Write an enzyme that holds these catalytic residues in place. Structure first.
Site, PDB file in Angstrom:
ATOM      1  N   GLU A 130      18.373   9.529  12.072  1.00 19.88           N
ATOM      2  CA  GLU A 130      17.718   9.768  10.831  1.00 19.88           C
ATOM      3  C   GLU A 130      18.667   9.798   9.627  1.00 19.88           C
ATOM      4  O   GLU A 130      19.872   9.751   9.792  1.00 19.88           O
ATOM      5  CB  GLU A 130      17.028  11.154  10.961  1.00 19.88           C
ATOM      6  CG  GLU A 130      15.784  11.169  11.835  1.00 19.88           C
ATOM      7  CD  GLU A 130      15.262  12.580  12.127  1.00 19.88           C
ATOM      8  OE1 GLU A 130      15.919  13.647  11.804  1.00 19.88           O
ATOM      9  OE2 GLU A 130      14.169  12.589  12.706  1.00 19.88           O
ATOM     10  N   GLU A 164      -1.310   3.750  -5.174  1.00 20.83           N
ATOM     11  CA  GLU A 164      -0.016   3.005  -5.432  1.00 20.83           C
ATOM     12  C   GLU A 164      -0.301   1.610  -5.913  1.00 20.83           C
ATOM     13  O   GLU A 164       0.400   1.123  -6.807  1.00 20.83           O
ATOM     14  CB  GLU A 164       0.943   2.953  -4.255  1.00 20.83           C
ATOM     15  CG  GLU A 164       1.725   4.261  -3.913  1.00 20.83           C
ATOM     16  CD  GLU A 164       0.938   5.385  -3.279  1.00 20.83           C
ATOM     17  OE1 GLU A 164      -0.282   5.238  -2.956  1.00 20.83           O
ATOM     18  OE2 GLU A 164       1.582   6.488  -3.093  1.00 20.83           O
TER      19      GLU A 164
HETATM   20  C1  LIG Z   1      12.394   4.352   2.296  1.00 18.48           C
HETATM   21  C2  LIG Z   1      12.008   5.074   3.532  1.00 18.48           C
HETATM   22  C3  LIG Z   1      11.188   6.191   3.333  1.00 18.48           C
HETATM   23  C4  LIG Z   1      10.832   7.045   4.396  1.00 18.48           C
HETATM   24  C5  LIG Z   1      11.236   6.712   5.689  1.00 18.48           C
HETATM   25  C6  LIG Z   1      12.082   5.615   5.927  1.00 18.48           C
HETATM   26  C7  LIG Z   1      12.450   4.787   4.822  1.00 18.48           C
HETATM   27  C8  LIG Z   1      13.256   3.586   4.884  1.00 18.48           C
HETATM   28  C9  LIG Z   1      12.414   5.428   7.374  1.00 18.48           C
HETATM   29  C10 LIG Z   1      11.191   4.833   8.116  1.00 18.48           C
HETATM   30  C11 LIG Z   1      13.594   4.477   7.704  1.00 18.48           C
HETATM   31  C12 LIG Z   1      12.899   6.804   7.901  1.00 18.48           C
HETATM   32  C13 LIG Z   1      11.766   7.782   7.887  1.00 18.48           C
HETATM   33  C14 LIG Z   1      12.355   9.131   8.029  1.00 18.48           C
HETATM   34  O1  LIG Z   1      12.625   9.567   9.169  1.00 18.48           O
HETATM   35  C15 LIG Z   1      12.755   9.967   6.833  1.00 18.48           C
HETATM   36  C16 LIG Z   1      11.761  10.884   6.382  1.00 18.48           C
HETATM   37  C17 LIG Z   1      11.692  11.182   5.047  1.00 18.48           C
HETATM   38  C18 LIG Z   1      10.721  12.093   4.579  1.00 18.48           C
HETATM   39  C19 LIG Z   1       9.806  12.683   5.485  1.00 18.48           C
HETATM   40  C20 LIG Z   1       9.949  12.439   6.810  1.00 18.48           C
HETATM   41  C21 LIG Z   1      10.906  11.527   7.265  1.00 18.48           C
HETATM   42  N1  LIG Z   1      10.875   7.547   6.737  1.00 18.48           N
HETATM   43  C22 LIG Z   1       9.777   8.386   6.587  1.00 18.48           C
HETATM   44  C23 LIG Z   1       9.400   8.718   5.282  1.00 18.48           C
HETATM   45  N2  LIG Z   1       8.394   9.657   5.087  1.00 18.48           N
HETATM   46  C24 LIG Z   1       7.664  10.192   6.071  1.00 18.48           C
HETATM   47  O2  LIG Z   1       6.717  10.974   5.884  1.00 18.48           O
HETATM   48  N3  LIG Z   1       8.006   9.824   7.321  1.00 18.48           N
HETATM   49  C25 LIG Z   1       9.032   8.951   7.650  1.00 18.48           C
HETATM   50  O3  LIG Z   1       9.167   8.677   8.871  1.00 18.48           O
HETATM   51  N4  LIG Z   1      10.032   8.186   4.203  1.00 18.48           N
HETATM   52  C26 LIG Z   1       9.760   8.823   2.916  1.00 18.48           C
HETATM   53  C27 LIG Z   1       8.428   8.467   2.214  1.00 18.48           C
HETATM   54  O4  LIG Z   1       8.205   7.055   2.119  1.00 18.48           O
HETATM   55  C28 LIG Z   1       8.374   9.093   0.801  1.00 18.48           C
HETATM   56  O5  LIG Z   1       8.476  10.507   0.983  1.00 18.48           O
HETATM   57  C29 LIG Z   1       7.116   8.705   0.005  1.00 18.48           C
HETATM   58  O6  LIG Z   1       7.049   9.501  -1.168  1.00 18.48           O
HETATM   59  C30 LIG Z   1       5.844   8.930   0.827  1.00 18.48           C
HETATM   60  O7  LIG Z   1       4.711   8.333   0.091  1.00 18.48           O
HETATM   61  P1  LIG Z   1       3.563   9.348  -0.443  1.00 18.48           P
HETATM   62  O8  LIG Z   1       3.218  10.280   0.674  1.00 18.48           O
HETATM   63  O9  LIG Z   1       4.136  10.119  -1.600  1.00 18.48           O
HETATM   64  O10 LIG Z   1       2.473   8.352  -0.827  1.00 18.48           O
HETATM   65  K   LIG Z   2       4.170   6.485  -2.145  1.00 14.46           K
HETATM   66 MN   LIG Z   3       1.083   8.446  -2.507  1.00 11.07          MN
END
Ligand SMILES: Cc1cc2c3c(c1C)C(C)(C)C[C@@H](C(=O)Cc1ccccc1)N3c1c([nH]c(=O)[nH]c1=O)N2C[C@H](O)[C@H](O)[C@H](O)COP(=O)(O)O
Ligand SMILES: [K+]
Ligand SMILES: [Mn+2]
Ligand SMILES: Cc1cc2c3c(c1C)C(C)(C)C[C@@H](C(=O)Cc1ccccc1)N3c1c([nH]c(=O)[nH]c1=O)N2C[C@H](O)[C@H](O)[C@H](O)COP(=O)(O)O
Ligand SMILES: [K+]
Ligand SMILES: [K+]
Ligand SMILES: [K+]
Ligand SMILES: [Mn+2]
Lengths: 500, 500
Positions: free
Chosen positions: B279, B230
């Site tokens: 969530e 990144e």
């Molecule tokens: C903007 C934001 C994003 C996420 C999350 C929250 C916010 C504000 C919070 C912390 C508020 C909520 C939380 C979530 O509960 C939502 C979630 C989304 C996707 C997967 C699991 C949880 N979370 C999160 C997230 N990814 C997760 O692997 N667990 C996470 O804990 N994400 C998503 C994650 O950043 C994206 O999928 C990226 O593509 C991941 O980067 P790469 O793996 O591709 O390098």
């Molecule tokens: K990423």
């Molecule tokens: Mn990545």
């Protein structure tokens, strides 16, 4: 006369409400009146009253557009509908629909015959009118005719005289003394037309009344049961007998204060070109003309300074959403309850182009049934989709007690997060379909069959032990004393009226 | 330093924009800061900067809520997102997403190592901090822990040193020197964690940086490809090398202007209780605690007057909708195009709780393919749902050229009127599912598999000869000169500002 019992009084109510714009300069019925009305409908503006139509002849006619459309503020959003029903303008949708259902467990109040009324102030015989010379609107640029009939009430009676139906169905001018229109199953006008066809002896006596009592046009747009005379149901709802007058050329009876009445016959043998028309789902398919029902007009009677109501239908939000959708949902609520299903509330979300109905479930009652999603889905869909009241509806969304089905946002939330695609749905292919929906009539499958689904947005524990979540929102994820403190300090901290 | 390259500068930009409220009186991190932020998010208010947290110790910490949430006016609705990217505040979603994709066909610009930065102004060793004594927020009343980590960036590197990933994943305080969090497939933090597990020799070197360069937190929230660092993608996007400093206790590198940095290890063997948490889909399931990844914290470094960004996530609209949803849609758009599919635009409608993506199709290109709905649906779904970029998305809606996928209302219209339930959809049961969606993890089926669908809202002639309708709306059902006349006379007749 009160606004709910007299269209002319209803127009004066809208004025007084500051919910009317009177346009006294000339307006062209070729497109311009409908374009102004369409814009009103897309913006929830005031209803337009066109007092100066280009080509208005012999007192025929003024136009009122957007008679049943929405107001801009949330507080009296449904106020124009409330004014059809003697309800306060701040009435909720639940209160409007309850009013429309209230006559379903009352005895009918049959109508009263009176010797005359305002609708007989003027008359034109066969040699004196020509429907092609009246200021009939062209509503959409690609329409296949000038749709005179978008908000009047067709009046037909069974051959045996035991059932008189009032309904809205579209019609357009065919020539100087005929209309063509939609008459399609399972609609009551079609059911009655079939009865006269089977008897085979004469054309159907008919009248079309425009600017009828607002409470009557509401019932005209509701799928009350087969064999139930709308006049007696409206009577019961309003608590008063409606006054009707006999037509001059046949023995049907029309509302005494109707603005304009056409008297004649609906043919049991003849057809004519009808359509296309810009319709409720937001489309017109130019060139899509088909043979339809043909009506002959023998006489016109009308009030002095007669006013023609008009629906400029299409994309959100007009009468075809607020009335067709909501009133079908109301009838569905009742049908479900009569079939011992624990449904408290129903509404057709505008966001679904009124093709969905959301059914709110009393989940305490549901738990006591000791059933499953698949069983329950099937049961609800078999009740609703094999009934006429379900005709226009292609998707039913079942939701628990925490969802307000009158709020589209909350229905979409529940649908999107609680119903697993496929697994939580049952498809219904052997039920009558609504062909007007583009994906039906212009789609990949049979225009008249199937395409329906029950989508279960109940969560698993709603069938067993009770809801096992809280919303992650301000209302549910914070204690009451904190919430109140935040709200009390909101403007003091620097952050940003019910009527608006 | 510019706002897109320095969080502290970004906060000053929001002030200048009158898009910030500074709250200088004491606010409790137990619920009150998150309740204020939740209300901001539900109302699209100004972002709250809590300069006086109860229990703030040794400069740790202020909180900024709602860093990536929406503004109230339509004109600069996405302005807070634009400010992460050096875009004008009136930037459209298409322009934000194009900026986020722009680095996908540029060489990376690797980061620059500098000897120090603001993030080293203060430090605390193992014997001097306690994570249970910092003003870490309780975000929702039923959360299973205090979620310190909702908007920081986890930094982990492959064992071979060739890939350094930056991502957001939630974490909560476990005890004085450990966190527990979500580390789940197919996420890159999980993919890297697996690599260290298979090597089996040590825990994963780790750092978590809070208040990083806004352009970096945007990339952190985007599913850029496997193996892509990144930092180099952000470099390319911004046209500048990012300045990083080495951690004190390991050899990873953090943004020089990070507000707060935790340095330590992500265990390859240990787990601890994590969750529940309120969530993105708008729910919390109280008591739903599971074993998760465990992190040890060895050191904290931080800016003077350090600021912790926080997402108070749940119902609409917060960072989990604006960033997760939109940035996954962007990556999906690109994936489709790389697979020779004629997709012009993609967006995850907020109305779908970002569980749908609408794909706008170039139907001229589609016609040239000489294909069918069933074939095309299958092809699009096989591309997207077997890729990581499709992980969070359960429904894809295919729409023609007339639909603006960035407008939820128009996506719902097309879905509701052009896609026949069942017939026009293909279900995908053998693809990875997103278990956070209630109908997955708390539903009737397997939490991690299936539940996905491609819904085709293309009409039949869009595959063959071209669109064969016009909308029944003001824009399409009236000629241009009439439309303009109506608009010119609108206020003159009596009917009712772009910025607001
Ligand atoms: C903007 C934001 C994003 C996420 C999350 C929250 C916010 C504000 C919070 C912390 C508020 C909520 C939380 C979530 O509960 C939502 C979630 C989304 C996707 C997967 C699991 C949880 N979370 C999160 C997230 N990814 C997760 O692997 N667990 C996470 O804990 N994400 C998503 C994650 O950043 C994206 O999928 C990226 O593509 C991941 O980067 P790469 O793996 O591709 O390098
Ligand atoms: K990423
Ligand atoms: Mn990545
Ligand atoms: C409020 C309104 C209602 C309708 C219609 C329009 C408007 C404003 C117009 C004229 C603007 C549009 C038109 C439609 O094109 C929409 C439509 C809806 C349902 C069936 C066909 C068409 N229409 C109409 C309609 N019923 C139809 O049988 N052809 C119609 O032409 N309806 C629906 C109809 O009134 C209800 O289904 C009633 O239950 C019928 O009464 P019963 O048969 O139960 O006694
Ligand atoms: K009726
Ligand atoms: K369900
Ligand atoms: K389709
Ligand atoms: Mn009837």
């Amino acid at each position: 006369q009160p606004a709910h019992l007299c269209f002319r009084s209803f127009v004066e109510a809208l004025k007084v409400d500051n919910d009317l714009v009177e346009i006294n300069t000339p307006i062209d019925p070729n497109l311009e009146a409908a374009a102004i009305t369409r814009r009103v409908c897309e913006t929830n503006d005031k209803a337009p009253l066109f007092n100066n139509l280009i080509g208005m002849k012999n007192g025929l006619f003024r136009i009122l557009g957007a008679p049943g459309s929405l107001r801009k503020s949330s507080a009296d959003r449904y106020g124009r509908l409330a004014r059809h029903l003697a309800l306060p303008p701040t009435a909720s949708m639940r209160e409007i629909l309850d009013k429309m259902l209230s006559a379903s467990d009352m005895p009918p109040i049959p109508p009263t015959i009176v010797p005359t009324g305002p609708c007989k102030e003027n008359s034109l015989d066969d040699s004196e009118f020509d429907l092609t010379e009246l200021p009939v609107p062209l509503i959409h640029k690609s329409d296949g005719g000038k749709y005179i009939q978008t908000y009047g009430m067709h009046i037909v009676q069974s051959p045996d005289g035991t059932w008189t139906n009032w309904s809205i169905a579209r019609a357009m001018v065919h020539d100087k003394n005929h209309l063509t229109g939609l008459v399609i199953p399972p609609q009551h006008i079609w059911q009655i037309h079939q009865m006269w066809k089977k008897e085979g002896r004469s054309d159907v006596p008919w009248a079309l009344a425009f600017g009828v009592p607002p409470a009557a046009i509401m019932a005209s747009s509701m799928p009350i049961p087969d064999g139930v005379t709308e006049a007696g149901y409206v009577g019961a709802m309003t608590g008063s007998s409606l006054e009707l007058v006999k037509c001059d050329t046949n023995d049907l009876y029309v509302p005494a204060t109707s603005e304009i009445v056409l008297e004649g016959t609906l043919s049991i043998s003849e057809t004519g070109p009808q359509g296309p028309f810009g319709e409720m789902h937001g489309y017109i398919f130019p060139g899509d003309t088909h043979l339809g029902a043909k009506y002959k007009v023998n006489r016109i009677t009308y009030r002095n300074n007669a006013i023609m109501p008009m629906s400029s239908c299409g994309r959100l939000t007009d009468e075809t959403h607020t009335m067709i959708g909501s009133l079908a949902a109301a009838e569905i609520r009742k049908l479900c309850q009569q079939n011992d299903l624990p449904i408290t509330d129903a509404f057709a979300p505008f966001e679904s182009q009124v093709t969905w109905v959301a059914l709110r479930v009393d989940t305490e009652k549901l738990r006591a049934m000791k059933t499953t999603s698949e069983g329950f889905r099937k049961r609800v869909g078999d009740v609703v989709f094999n009934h006429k009241a379900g005709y226009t509806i292609h998707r039913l969304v079942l939701v628990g007690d925490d969802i307000d089905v009158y709020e589209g946002k909350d229905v979409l939330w529940a649908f999107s997060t609680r119903c697993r695609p496929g697994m939580d749905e049952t498809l219904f292919e052997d039920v009558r379909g609504f062909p007007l929906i583009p994906y039906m009539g212009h789609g990949n499958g049979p225009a008249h069959r199937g395409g329906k689904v029950v989508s279960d947005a109940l969560m698993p524990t709603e069938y067993t032990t009770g809801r096992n979540w809280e919303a992650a929102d301000f209302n549910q994820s914070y204690p009451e004393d904190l919430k109140q403190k935040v709200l009390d300090n909101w403007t003091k901290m620097g952050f940003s009226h019910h009527h608006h």
